[PDB]
Design a protein around this motif. Structure first.
Motif, PDB file in Angstrom:
ATOM      1  N   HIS A  16       0.830  -1.195   0.000  1.00  0.00           N
ATOM      2  CA  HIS A  16       0.000   0.000   0.000  1.00  0.00           C
ATOM      3  C   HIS A  16       0.869   1.250   0.000  1.00  0.00           C
ATOM      4  O   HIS A  16       1.862   1.330   0.728  1.00  0.00           O
ATOM      5  CB  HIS A  16      -0.931   0.011   1.212  1.00  0.00           C
ATOM      6  CG  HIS A  16      -2.120   0.902   1.046  1.00  0.00           C
ATOM      7  ND1 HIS A  16      -2.157   2.189   1.535  1.00  0.00           N
ATOM      8  CD2 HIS A  16      -3.314   0.692   0.445  1.00  0.00           C
ATOM      9  CE1 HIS A  16      -3.323   2.734   1.241  1.00  0.00           C
ATOM     10  NE2 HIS A  16      -4.044   1.847   0.581  1.00  0.00           N
ATOM     11  N   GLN A  24      -2.341   2.743   7.204  1.00  0.00           N
ATOM     12  CA  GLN A  24      -2.665   2.777   5.782  1.00  0.00           C
ATOM     13  C   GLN A  24      -4.160   2.605   5.543  1.00  0.00           C
ATOM     14  O   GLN A  24      -4.731   3.251   4.657  1.00  0.00           O
ATOM     15  CB  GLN A  24      -1.878   1.697   5.042  1.00  0.00           C
ATOM     16  CG  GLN A  24      -2.311   0.279   5.365  1.00  0.00           C
ATOM     17  CD  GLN A  24      -1.433  -0.759   4.704  1.00  0.00           C
ATOM     18  OE1 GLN A  24      -0.209  -0.644   4.706  1.00  0.00           O
ATOM     19  NE2 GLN A  24      -2.055  -1.777   4.127  1.00  0.00           N
ATOM     20  N   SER A  25      -4.816   1.748   6.325  1.00  0.00           N
ATOM     21  CA  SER A  25      -6.237   1.506   6.102  1.00  0.00           C
ATOM     22  C   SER A  25      -7.072   2.716   6.500  1.00  0.00           C
ATOM     23  O   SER A  25      -8.013   3.088   5.790  1.00  0.00           O
ATOM     24  CB  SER A  25      -6.689   0.268   6.874  1.00  0.00           C
ATOM     25  OG  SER A  25      -5.937  -0.870   6.495  1.00  0.00           O
ATOM     26  N   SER A  28      -6.177   5.645   4.059  1.00  0.00           N
ATOM     27  CA  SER A  28      -6.719   5.364   2.736  1.00  0.00           C
ATOM     28  C   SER A  28      -8.206   5.683   2.678  1.00  0.00           C
ATOM     29  O   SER A  28      -8.702   6.143   1.644  1.00  0.00           O
ATOM     30  CB  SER A  28      -6.477   3.900   2.373  1.00  0.00           C
ATOM     31  OG  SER A  28      -7.016   3.591   1.100  1.00  0.00           O
ATOM     32  N   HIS A  31      -8.577   9.387   2.511  1.00  0.00           N
ATOM     33  CA  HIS A  31      -8.245   9.805   1.154  1.00  0.00           C
ATOM     34  C   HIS A  31      -9.402   9.545   0.199  1.00  0.00           C
ATOM     35  O   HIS A  31      -9.673  10.357  -0.692  1.00  0.00           O
ATOM     36  CB  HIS A  31      -6.985   9.079   0.686  1.00  0.00           C
ATOM     37  CG  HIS A  31      -6.572   9.420  -0.711  1.00  0.00           C
ATOM     38  ND1 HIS A  31      -5.738  10.477  -1.004  1.00  0.00           N
ATOM     39  CD2 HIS A  31      -6.867   8.834  -1.895  1.00  0.00           C
ATOM     40  CE1 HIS A  31      -5.544  10.533  -2.308  1.00  0.00           C
ATOM     41  NE2 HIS A  31      -6.218   9.547  -2.873  1.00  0.00           N
ATOM     42  N   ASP A  32     -10.095   8.418   0.368  1.00  0.00           N
ATOM     43  CA  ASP A  32     -11.212   8.100  -0.515  1.00  0.00           C
ATOM     44  C   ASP A  32     -12.408   9.003  -0.242  1.00  0.00           C
ATOM     45  O   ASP A  32     -13.114   9.403  -1.174  1.00  0.00           O
ATOM     46  CB  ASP A  32     -11.599   6.631  -0.352  1.00  0.00           C
ATOM     47  CG  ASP A  32     -10.520   5.688  -0.842  1.00  0.00           C
ATOM     48  OD1 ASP A  32      -9.729   6.092  -1.719  1.00  0.00           O
ATOM     49  OD2 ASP A  32     -10.463   4.542  -0.352  1.00  0.00           O
TER      50      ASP A  32
END
Ligand code: FES
Ligand SMILES: [K+]
Ligand SMILES: [Mg+2]
Ligand SMILES: [Mg+2]
Ligand SMILES: [Mg+2]
Ligand SMILES: [Mg+2]
Ligand SMILES: [Mg+2]
Ligand SMILES: [Mg+2]
Ligand SMILES: [Mg+2]
Ligand SMILES: [Mg+2]
Lengths: 49, 135, 86, 100, 137, 97
Positions: A16, A24-25, A28, A31-32
């Motif tokens: 990732h 990261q999860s 992320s 970010h989405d």
RNA sequence: CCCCACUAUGCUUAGCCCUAAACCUCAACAGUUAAAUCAACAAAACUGCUCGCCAGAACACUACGAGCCACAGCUUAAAACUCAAA
């Protein structure tokens, strides 16, 4: 207990692109969600908790 | 085995030395690239110091000869009611149009300053430019 | 004593409102420094003590004005978050 | 015959403008937060202007506006500081909308 | 005309009047508000005494004299003796920052007198006598 | 070398320095009208430079002029002469109600 | 310590006395801002040059001597005994 999968391969490269944040999860997802809010601008209760 | 003394030399010098001493068994992936294409300055920690007494920064103010013409034009005629468009790289303001005519007339041999400024205003009025004196 | 009377430190009362006239007079005497002057003069302040307080008052005023200027300058960015989520 | 940097700088509109105080410039709204309009006008930093009370709905992303510049960068040095404090934004007054 | 907090200047032609009397003719209530007492004297424009009252003459003693209610009582007493002599409007001249500075004026009003102006005449020396040494408390 | 390089000179866009309302004018102790503009109407107190906006030099001249005029018999000490209450208000002080 | 009264004294004149936490607690002059910035705190760190001064604490703003309009004074200023700190 569910075990988090390997976060890199044999070459040592993390899968990732947000690995080195350590979250990261989570990042992320931010970010989405942040990306969706942007596209809307370019385009433009009781039973749930 | 390595060195985290970031204030002792540079990553290159610290890495090169520990490779020679055998402390680092293999060179890092970046070492050969740094060696072939090094930076202009070797990245060595420095402590920024404050200037005292007669020490002054070497940076110089940027000025041009036409700046004298621009200062007078803004004083006499003010900033043009026309709006600057800093997005257009070839934009010309009323002051720039004044400066270019002022430069043309100077090259025609005129050398007086007060006379070279009044003739320029007339030329632009003939061309249809609006020059409202501030006072 | 030798001056004319009923000119200095004199406030006229409007519509019988004596409370507002007294507050105006007290505000005048305060702004001109007479109230603090009267109080400091009840007992003798020694010259070394007057210099210390005057020096303390002058440094506190500068420090407060400089701390107000900093907050005014750094409150321009108190607007809502422009990049929320990032 | 490659243009030099000194030539680009001499003939740049930002160089030709001179001082920015009380200069009318054309800006473009690129980001909006409630009634805060973020406007780029060709400088290093954007300015943030509140939506005008009249014709507020005409100010949208991409709308080009007229500004009166005050400072290209808001900076000040405060007592006991080795450098200048910067808010990373320009100071400008929003006059209205630019139309053709 | 708009209201002026500045008193009328003697010799000029003002239109202000109080019972047909000019500012220069209104009697004066002199209030001395000390730290331990309050003294009130009402005088005419010609400096004729009309009434005098203090916290001490109103039966207050020691620390009770240095209270607002004692000064208010002194004002009422001075107002009563002044009203009998024909005084309605008074100019207030108060010297001192004692507790009866404002309360003495209230008593004058409750006693039937109308205050048209307030003047502070607290003595401030411009350089004068050395005050007593500071207290160690 | 290159014609477009910057040239050394003094700032052509520099603005003049600020000036007090009395910069360039003679302050006389006999001009009580001018001096009265810098004293308190109610108390006659001389205003500090933070109220008068004067520079150090003119703040000093005004102060010395006031003190001279007061003790020489031209200017009152304990109040502003009422004749000058309607003169232009040049001081940054707000008093009444 | 708090309240009141009052004196020497604070003032002037003419003589003395010559002390202060007389302290920016920063000697005078000249120079530097690059080096290592720098025990700490104070007040960024230093160089040249000169004078003055200092060499554990306490004894000691003392003793004795000398000088001085000073005579319960000032200046200069030790030693013995004592300690392993100050
Ligand atoms: S600014 Fe020039 S005399 Fe005041
Ligand atoms: K000191
Ligand atoms: Mg005596
Ligand atoms: Mg004297
Ligand atoms: Mg001293
Ligand atoms: Mg010396
Ligand atoms: Mg020793
Ligand atoms: Mg001694
Ligand atoms: Mg001795
Ligand atoms: Mg002896």
């Amino acid at each position: 207990p569910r075990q988090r999968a390997i976060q890199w391969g044999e070459d040592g490269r993390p899968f990732h692109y947000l690995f080195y944040t350590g979250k990261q999860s989570y990042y992320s997802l931010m970010h989405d969600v942040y990306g969706m809010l942007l596209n809307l601008e370019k385009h433009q209760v009781i039973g749930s908790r | 085995a390595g060195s985290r003394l970031e204030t002792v030399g540079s990553i290159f010098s610290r890495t090169r030395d520990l490779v020679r001493a055998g402390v680092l068994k293999e060179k890092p992936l970046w070492f050969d690239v740094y060696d072939a294409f090094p930076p202009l300055r070797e990245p060595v920690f420095q402590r920024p110091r404050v200037r005292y007494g007669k020490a002054k920064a070497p940076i110089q103010d940027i000025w041009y000869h036409e700046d004298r013409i621009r200062a007078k034009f803004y004083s006499v005629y003010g900033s043009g009611q026309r709006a600057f468009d800093l997005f257009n790289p070839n934009f010309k303001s009323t002051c720039q149009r004044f400066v270019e005519k002022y430069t043309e007339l100077q090259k025609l041999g005129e050398t007086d300053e007060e006379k070279l400024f009044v003739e320029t205003g007339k030329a632009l009025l003939a061309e249809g430019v609006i020059l409202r004196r501030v006072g | 004593a030798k001056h004319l009377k009923f000119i200095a430190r004199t406030v006229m009362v409007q519509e019988g409102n004596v409370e507002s006239a007294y507050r105006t007079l007290n505000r005048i005497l305060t702004m001109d420094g007479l109230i603090e002057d009267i109080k400091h003069r009840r007992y003798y302040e020694k010259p070394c003590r007057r210099r210390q307080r005057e020096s303390y008052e002058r440094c506190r005023r500068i420090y407060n004005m400089e701390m107000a200027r900093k907050i005014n300058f750094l409150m321009r960015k108190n607007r809502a978050d422009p990049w929320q989520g990032c | 015959n490659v243009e030099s940097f000194a030539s680009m700088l001499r003939h740049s509109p930002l160089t030709q403008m001179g001082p920015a105080k009380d200069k009318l410039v054309i800006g473009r709204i690129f980001h909006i937060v409630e009634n805060d309009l973020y406007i780029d006008f060709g400088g290093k930093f954007h300015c943030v202007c509140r939506r005008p009370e009249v014709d507020g709905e005409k100010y949208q992303k991409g709308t080009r506006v007229r500004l009166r510049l005050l400072d290209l960068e808001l900076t000040s040095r405060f007592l006991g500081a080795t450098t200048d404090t910067t808010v990373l934004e320009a100071n400008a007054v929003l006059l209205g909308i630019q139309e053709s | 005309t708009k209201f002026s907090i500045y008193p009328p200047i003697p010799g000029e032609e003002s239109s202000l009047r109080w019972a047909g009397k000019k500012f220069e003719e209104i009697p004066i209530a002199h209030i001395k508000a000390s730290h331990n007492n309050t003294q009130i004297q009402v005088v005419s424009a010609s400096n004729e005494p009309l009434a005098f009252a203090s916290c001490g003459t109103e039966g207050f003693r020691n620390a009770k004299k240095g209270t607002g209610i004692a000064a208010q009582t002194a004002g009422i007493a001075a107002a009563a003796r002044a009203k009998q002599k024909g005084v309605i409007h008074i100019r207030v001249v108060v010297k001192g920052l004692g507790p009866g500075r404002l309360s003495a004026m209230h008593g004058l009003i409750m006693g039937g007198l109308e205050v048209i102006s307030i003047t502070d005449n607290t003595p401030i020396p411009h350089x004068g006598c050395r005050p007593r040494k500071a207290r160690k408390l | 070398s290159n014609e477009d390089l910057p040239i050394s000179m003094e700032n052509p866009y520099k603005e003049p320095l600020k000036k007090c309302i009395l910069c360039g004018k003679h302050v006389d102790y006999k001009n009580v009208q001018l001096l009265s503009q810098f004293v308190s109407p109610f108390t006659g107190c001389i205003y500090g430079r933070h109220i008068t906006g004067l520079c150090g030099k003119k703040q000093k001249e005004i102060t010395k002029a006031i003190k001279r005029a007061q003790i020489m018999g031209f200017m009152p000490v304990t109040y502003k002469d009422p004749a000058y209450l309607k003169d232009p208000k040049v001081c940054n002080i707000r008093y009444r109600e």
